[PDB]
Amino acid sequence: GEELFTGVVPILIELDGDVNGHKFFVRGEGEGDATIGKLSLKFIATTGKLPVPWPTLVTTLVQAFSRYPDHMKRHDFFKSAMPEGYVQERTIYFKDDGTYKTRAEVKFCGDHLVNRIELKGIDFKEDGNILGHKLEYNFNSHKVYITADKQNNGIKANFTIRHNVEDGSVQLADHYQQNTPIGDGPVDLPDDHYLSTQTILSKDLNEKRDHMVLLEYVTAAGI
Ligand SMILES: [Zn+2]
């Protein structure tokens, strides 16, 4: 379980997307180090220019790499579901705009962790901040609130992402999340806690394809 995360783990990410009928595919690679709670990844849109801004996809595009400090180990659901993995599902409500629905499988393939995601988005406004590409290329820090869902032998989470808009306003995205283990056996159901997240988005200046370089630090807290 946790024993699979004592060192650096290579990551492959795939996202098959469809927002208001605009189809796209994103592929990411890099590495995660759960001992420090660090993720370094590069994402490419293989279908050309995205119909939505990169920041809207960040939350979707491996919380198993969160640093859980020693006293909180017993509360790390994400690692305890490995290698078989977990399903992660979300509904994301963009305030005054459309919604994303996502379903992902996060599991080991041999020595590498893979996150495979399907995303469907509906009811977005033409000129809105999302389809109008009015969101800044950056990301804020958040708290991801996690609670046990004993019925499903898993967890739920709730949080609101704050996306900065070009005109100086903020676009809120309310996230509702569920995770359930894929394989049989026991998993760790946690007491209430949160993950504190920080993310930096950048560009590779030699990369001509549409892309996003990401560095994140996440540490669990609240117990
Ligand atoms: Zn693989």
Short mmCIF file of C-alpha atoms and ligand atoms in Angstrom, two decimals:
data_model
loop_
_atom_site.label_atom_id
_atom_site.label_comp_id
_atom_site.label_asym_id
_atom_site.label_seq_id
_atom_site.Cartn_x
_atom_site.Cartn_y
_atom_site.Cartn_z
CA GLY A 1 0.00 0.00 0.00
CA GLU A 2 2.02 2.91 1.41
CA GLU A 3 5.12 0.75 0.68
CA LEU A 4 4.72 1.56 -3.06
CA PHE A 5 5.32 5.28 -2.36
CA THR A 6 8.65 5.30 -0.45
CA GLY A 7 10.48 6.56 -3.57
CA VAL A 8 9.91 8.43 -6.82
CA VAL A 9 7.12 6.91 -8.99
CA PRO A 10 6.66 7.58 -12.72
CA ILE A 11 3.21 8.81 -13.77
CA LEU A 12 1.23 8.58 -17.03
CA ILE A 13 -2.04 10.52 -17.37
CA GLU A 14 -4.67 10.33 -20.11
CA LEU A 15 -7.81 12.49 -20.39
CA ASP A 16 -10.49 11.94 -23.08
CA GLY A 17 -12.64 15.09 -23.10
CA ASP A 18 -15.84 16.47 -24.56
CA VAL A 19 -17.08 19.92 -23.55
CA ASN A 20 -20.24 21.19 -25.32
CA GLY A 21 -19.38 18.77 -28.14
CA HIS A 22 -15.77 20.00 -28.55
CA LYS A 23 -13.64 16.87 -28.30
CA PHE A 24 -10.06 16.76 -27.11
CA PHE A 25 -7.42 14.44 -25.71
CA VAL A 26 -4.63 15.25 -23.20
CA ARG A 27 -1.60 13.11 -22.32
CA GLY A 28 0.70 13.83 -19.36
CA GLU A 29 3.93 12.35 -17.93
CA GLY A 30 6.24 12.97 -15.07
CA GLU A 31 6.81 11.76 -11.54
CA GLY A 32 5.46 11.88 -7.98
CA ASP A 33 7.27 11.74 -4.63
CA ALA A 34 4.86 11.21 -1.79
CA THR A 35 7.58 11.49 0.88
CA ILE A 36 7.63 15.26 0.13
CA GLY A 37 4.17 15.52 -1.47
CA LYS A 38 5.56 16.63 -4.83
CA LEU A 39 4.29 16.18 -8.42
CA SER A 40 6.12 17.31 -11.55
CA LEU A 41 4.24 16.78 -14.82
CA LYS A 42 4.03 17.93 -18.41
CA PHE A 43 0.76 17.73 -20.33
CA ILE A 44 0.24 17.93 -24.09
CA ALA A 45 -3.07 18.41 -25.94
CA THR A 46 -2.60 15.87 -28.73
CA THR A 47 -5.68 17.06 -30.67
CA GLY A 48 -4.47 20.67 -31.09
CA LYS A 49 -5.57 23.81 -29.26
CA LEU A 50 -7.85 23.12 -26.30
CA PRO A 51 -11.46 24.37 -26.36
CA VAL A 52 -11.18 25.15 -22.64
CA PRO A 53 -8.42 26.74 -20.56
CA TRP A 54 -5.70 24.55 -19.06
CA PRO A 55 -6.42 25.69 -15.47
CA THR A 56 -9.97 24.21 -15.61
CA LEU A 57 -8.47 20.74 -16.07
CA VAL A 58 -5.84 20.84 -13.35
CA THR A 59 -7.89 19.34 -10.54
CA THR A 60 -8.84 16.48 -12.86
CA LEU A 61 -5.43 15.71 -14.36
CA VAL A 62 -3.23 11.62 -8.23
CA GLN A 63 -3.90 12.47 -4.59
CA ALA A 64 -2.08 9.27 -3.67
CA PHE A 65 1.07 11.48 -3.90
CA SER A 66 -0.07 13.64 -1.03
CA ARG A 67 2.28 13.75 1.90
CA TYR A 68 0.56 12.28 4.90
CA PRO A 69 2.73 13.01 7.96
CA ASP A 70 3.50 10.21 10.41
CA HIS A 71 0.67 10.73 12.89
CA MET A 72 -1.83 10.82 10.00
CA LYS A 73 -0.71 7.67 8.17
CA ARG A 74 -3.76 5.70 9.39
CA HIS A 75 -5.93 8.21 7.42
CA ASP A 76 -4.41 7.79 3.94
CA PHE A 77 -7.15 6.14 1.88
CA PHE A 78 -5.44 6.83 -1.47
CA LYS A 79 -2.26 4.81 -0.97
CA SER A 80 -4.06 2.01 0.90
CA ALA A 81 -6.10 1.19 -2.23
CA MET A 82 -2.90 0.50 -4.25
CA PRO A 83 -1.75 -1.23 -6.41
CA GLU A 84 -5.27 -2.21 -7.52
CA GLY A 85 -6.28 1.42 -7.22
CA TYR A 86 -9.42 3.54 -6.97
CA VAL A 87 -12.12 5.16 -9.05
CA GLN A 88 -12.32 8.93 -8.59
CA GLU A 89 -15.45 10.73 -9.67
CA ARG A 90 -16.41 14.36 -9.65
CA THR A 91 -19.01 16.85 -10.54
CA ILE A 92 -17.51 20.31 -10.96
CA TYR A 93 -19.95 23.28 -11.02
CA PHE A 94 -18.60 26.44 -12.58
CA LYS A 95 -20.53 29.27 -10.96
CA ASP A 96 -22.81 31.04 -13.46
CA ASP A 97 -21.64 28.61 -16.16
CA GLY A 98 -21.50 24.91 -17.06
CA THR A 99 -20.52 21.71 -15.29
CA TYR A 100 -17.85 19.02 -15.70
CA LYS A 101 -18.47 15.41 -14.88
CA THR A 102 -15.43 13.18 -14.56
CA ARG A 103 -14.61 9.54 -13.96
CA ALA A 104 -11.05 8.34 -13.47
CA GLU A 105 -9.24 5.12 -12.69
CA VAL A 106 -6.02 5.57 -10.74
CA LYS A 107 -3.89 2.45 -10.39
CA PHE A 108 -0.46 0.90 -10.87
CA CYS A 109 0.59 -0.52 -14.18
CA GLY A 110 3.74 -2.34 -13.25
CA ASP A 111 6.12 0.22 -11.73
CA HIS A 112 4.22 3.29 -12.96
CA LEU A 113 1.01 4.94 -11.65
CA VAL A 114 -1.59 5.73 -14.28
CA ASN A 115 -4.57 8.08 -14.14
CA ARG A 116 -7.09 7.46 -16.92
CA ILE A 117 -9.92 9.94 -17.10
CA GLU A 118 -13.06 10.61 -19.10
CA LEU A 119 -14.54 14.08 -18.83
CA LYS A 120 -17.84 15.38 -20.05
CA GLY A 121 -18.82 19.05 -19.89
CA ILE A 122 -22.18 20.60 -20.64
CA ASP A 123 -24.13 23.88 -20.56
CA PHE A 124 -21.14 26.18 -20.91
CA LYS A 125 -21.81 29.69 -22.14
CA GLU A 126 -20.25 30.80 -25.39
CA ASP A 127 -18.50 33.96 -24.13
CA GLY A 128 -18.32 32.78 -20.54
CA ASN A 129 -14.95 32.57 -18.82
CA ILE A 130 -14.36 28.96 -19.87
CA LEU A 131 -15.27 28.78 -23.59
CA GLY A 132 -14.21 32.42 -23.99
CA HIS A 133 -10.73 31.64 -22.60
CA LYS A 134 -10.75 34.44 -20.04
CA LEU A 135 -8.93 32.59 -17.27
CA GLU A 136 -5.35 33.47 -16.30
CA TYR A 137 -2.68 30.85 -16.76
CA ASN A 138 -2.04 30.29 -13.00
CA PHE A 139 -3.50 28.48 -9.95
CA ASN A 140 -4.25 29.32 -6.31
CA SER A 141 -3.78 27.37 -3.12
CA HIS A 142 -6.76 25.41 -1.65
CA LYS A 143 -7.96 23.09 1.08
CA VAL A 144 -9.50 19.76 -0.03
CA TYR A 145 -11.88 18.54 2.71
CA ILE A 146 -12.04 14.78 3.01
CA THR A 147 -14.60 12.61 4.87
CA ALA A 148 -15.23 8.89 5.14
CA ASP A 149 -17.99 7.20 3.19
CA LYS A 150 -18.37 3.89 5.06
CA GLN A 151 -21.23 2.80 2.80
CA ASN A 152 -19.00 2.75 -0.26
CA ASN A 153 -15.86 1.67 1.51
CA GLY A 154 -14.33 4.95 0.33
CA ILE A 155 -14.16 8.71 0.76
CA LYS A 156 -15.85 11.90 -0.33
CA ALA A 157 -14.33 15.34 -0.75
CA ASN A 158 -15.60 18.86 -1.22
CA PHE A 159 -13.80 22.10 -2.11
CA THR A 160 -14.13 25.26 -4.20
CA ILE A 161 -11.44 26.25 -6.69
CA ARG A 162 -10.83 29.94 -7.30
CA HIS A 163 -9.73 30.66 -10.88
CA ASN A 164 -8.40 34.13 -11.57
CA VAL A 165 -10.09 35.90 -14.48
CA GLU A 166 -8.27 38.31 -16.89
CA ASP A 167 -10.48 41.26 -15.81
CA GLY A 168 -9.58 40.79 -12.11
CA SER A 169 -12.72 38.84 -11.05
CA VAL A 170 -12.78 35.26 -9.78
CA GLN A 171 -14.45 32.23 -11.37
CA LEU A 172 -15.48 29.71 -8.70
CA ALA A 173 -15.61 25.97 -9.40
CA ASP A 174 -17.40 23.89 -6.72
CA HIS A 175 -16.04 20.35 -6.61
CA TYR A 176 -17.93 17.29 -5.32
CA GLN A 177 -15.78 14.14 -5.22
CA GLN A 178 -16.11 10.43 -4.52
CA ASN A 179 -13.45 7.72 -4.43
CA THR A 180 -14.03 3.97 -4.22
CA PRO A 181 -11.49 1.15 -4.27
CA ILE A 182 -11.28 -1.02 -7.38
CA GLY A 183 -9.92 -4.17 -5.75
CA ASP A 184 -11.11 -6.24 -2.79
CA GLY A 185 -9.45 -6.27 0.62
CA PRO A 186 -9.22 -3.60 3.28
CA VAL A 187 -8.57 0.06 2.86
CA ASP A 188 -8.16 2.88 5.36
CA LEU A 189 -11.24 5.01 6.05
CA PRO A 190 -10.12 8.32 7.52
CA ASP A 191 -11.40 10.76 10.11
CA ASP A 192 -12.18 14.19 8.73
CA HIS A 193 -9.16 16.08 7.45
CA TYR A 194 -7.97 18.18 4.55
CA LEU A 195 -5.24 18.37 1.96
CA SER A 196 -3.50 21.69 1.51
CA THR A 197 -2.45 22.28 -2.06
CA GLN A 198 -0.21 24.63 -3.96
CA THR A 199 0.28 24.55 -7.72
CA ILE A 200 2.50 26.39 -10.23
CA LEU A 201 1.76 26.35 -13.97
CA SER A 202 4.47 27.10 -16.50
CA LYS A 203 5.46 26.59 -20.13
CA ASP A 204 8.38 24.80 -21.76
CA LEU A 205 9.73 27.53 -24.05
CA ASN A 206 11.00 24.95 -26.61
CA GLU A 207 7.62 23.15 -26.81
CA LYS A 208 5.44 24.14 -29.80
CA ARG A 209 2.46 21.91 -29.07
CA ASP A 210 -0.27 23.19 -26.75
CA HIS A 211 0.88 22.13 -23.26
CA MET A 212 1.10 22.73 -19.51
CA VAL A 213 3.97 22.15 -17.14
CA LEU A 214 2.82 21.67 -13.56
CA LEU A 215 4.52 21.50 -10.14
CA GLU A 216 2.38 20.76 -7.04
CA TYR A 217 3.00 20.32 -3.33
CA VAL A 218 0.26 18.74 -1.24
CA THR A 219 0.39 17.90 2.46
CA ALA A 220 -2.41 16.44 4.60
CA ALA A 221 -3.34 18.26 7.75
CA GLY A 222 -6.13 18.83 10.26
CA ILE A 223 -5.52 15.98 12.74
ZN ZN B 1 0.83 1.59 -18.37
#
